[PDB]
Amino acid sequence: EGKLVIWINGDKGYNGLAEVGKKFEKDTGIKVTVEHPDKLEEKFPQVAATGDGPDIIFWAHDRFGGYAQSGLLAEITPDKAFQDKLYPFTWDAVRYNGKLIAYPIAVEALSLIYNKDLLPNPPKTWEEIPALDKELKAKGKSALMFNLQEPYFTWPLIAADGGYAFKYENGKYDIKDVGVDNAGAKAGLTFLVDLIKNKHMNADTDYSIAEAAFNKGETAMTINGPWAWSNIDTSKVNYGVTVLPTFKGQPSKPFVGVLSAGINAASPNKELAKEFLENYLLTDEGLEAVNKDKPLGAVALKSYEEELAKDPRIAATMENAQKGEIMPNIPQMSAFWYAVRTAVINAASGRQTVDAALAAAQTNAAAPGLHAIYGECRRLYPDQPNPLQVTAIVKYWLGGPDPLDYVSMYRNVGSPSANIPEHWHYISFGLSDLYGDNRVHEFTGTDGPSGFGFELTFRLKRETGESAPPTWPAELMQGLARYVFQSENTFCSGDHVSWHSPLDNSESRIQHMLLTEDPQMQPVQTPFGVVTFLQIVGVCTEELHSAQQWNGQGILELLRTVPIAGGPWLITDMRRGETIFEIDPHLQERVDKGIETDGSNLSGVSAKCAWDDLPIRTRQLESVHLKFNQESGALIPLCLRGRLLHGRHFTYKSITGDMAITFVSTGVEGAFATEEHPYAAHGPWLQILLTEEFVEKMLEDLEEFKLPKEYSWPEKKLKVSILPDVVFDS
């Protein structure tokens, strides 16, 4: 609005910012409003585009990387006079792609917390701690307790001797160069595991146990961030905060994240914001104002840190902050976090060796999505670690024709007791985000769908004495997958696919597909999003038609009741010769009611038909004669009962013509047919409006008699005929 609006999380000191907003108002006359709405990090991309976003946004740098790739943040341009007021490394935290995208405001870092009563002189090295633990154990106490389930707290030691996630040499992160496999990480984890083996620590320890312990006076030491402190103050423990122990002569690295403020690229007032950020907020007065209201922690302005630095506590956060590394901004951080955590836990529980866990972890950070899926696959099929797998040798993102990188092929023995035949279970890989580096699918985050948000599956009844699963279903999946990408049609459980081809290139009656949720596969959380599994179900042309006329869900249920045609898990039998309706005539009945009580999903059809026609004008007619093929005539009840009685339109379009006939219900909007003038036409396009009573009467009248079939009324006539449309006499 030419005024400055700021959105920030509910915890920090906005009133101080409001005071700075008042100070802004005094010196410049511009009103500064400060609000702190919920879930802002998610909201900013959503509203930033419209223009109702804030001019300035405050948050830890880790989000900003996402914001920067989406193009929501403006480049900031501070003079050297300014960049020198702040520490060089805080600027590093705000560089993406070599550009500066925010003013660093506050830095948070983990530190070593000790009880002054128990340990007057804290250890300067980790190697001392065992003996110290032994000493503390001597008086019924333990030395150290911290979260071993989350890598944020164990990474310093893992990072201590040379380990790293990504190295940025020019402000740009090399995503290939991962450092979870080197001697250092291995050194740290063996040491952690060794600490746990010698019962100096317990793999079970969590936030609350560690916190309860220090606050109750049960344990001697901890590692934590500023937020925890408030709770220790209430505990009245006399404690000091200092630098973390060194390992093998090198500093521990605690991830340091700096609260920063960025300027919205869609803001008119970018320069006002720059003036404000550089000359008012980043001053002793603005920061002091904010500090009194709610402490920021260790600030980024050298001058101000010195004022704050007497707090032994602040000193330690900044000592640790300088000694530690800055969090990466790329989205793959999410991938790193899942890998490590599993590695640490597995190494600590004895499930895996240190070398193997970190070796496994380095690799899993590369293609997490594939693996996460492999996880779900592993839960169902522990018996089959390696299944026959079709690989696309020419990868899609290098110009390849096949978008599914892998299709795994399993043998499911089934359950005879549940009437589930033995079958082959195909799972696809590529529709979801496997790699998460933007090679095929744009990265979206943990929230929201990974890639298209699903993978395809298929269940093919095993023929007797078949040694191996056939491969044609993979080619089918590739076909569908291409459609997904090109077609950009939504795929949800219940949707149908018109193929018109043998699914397996045989003479089978199964020539179409319906889609449903996989019976036994549960969806998964991959760092790049959520993945669900859509199973393909082979159907006959008649069954597809029923699905179109009613809905997919209903026909799926019908397929579940007839075991040969699907059963509870919907196994496709290509060899199947009968439709579900030929097997049980009463199923047709269930379909008709569904159409009655649900309406029909068919908005129109392409068929042989015509009406009497003849720079364009909307004509009105008092007489109308419609002509239909037997095939289209058959749908007239559906057109009337299914749509008009539910206030829904229906459209016939001529295969051979530009003619069209749209049956219109009352309450439809946008028709040029009125109750006053029911029959009207625009060029070859005809709309006819029918009142519900008339519709009911017509329905009674239509019901075998020899073609041609003629119906007549006091205003309109109808004919059903066959080859006349196909072949004219003139």
Author numbering: 5 to 618, 625 to 713, 720 to 746
What do the paper's sentences say?
SUFU is an essential intracellular negative regulator of mammalian Hedgehog signalling and acts by binding and modulating the activity of GLI transcription factors. Hedgehog signalling plays a fundamental role in the control of metazoan development, cell proliferation and differentiation, as highlighted by the fact that its deregulation is associated with the development of many human tumours. Here, the crystal and small-angle X-ray scattering structures of full-length human SUFU and its complex with the key SYGHL motif conserved in all GLIs are reported. It is demonstrated that GLI binding is associated with major conformational changes in SUFU, including an intrinsically disordered loop that is also crucial for pathway activation.
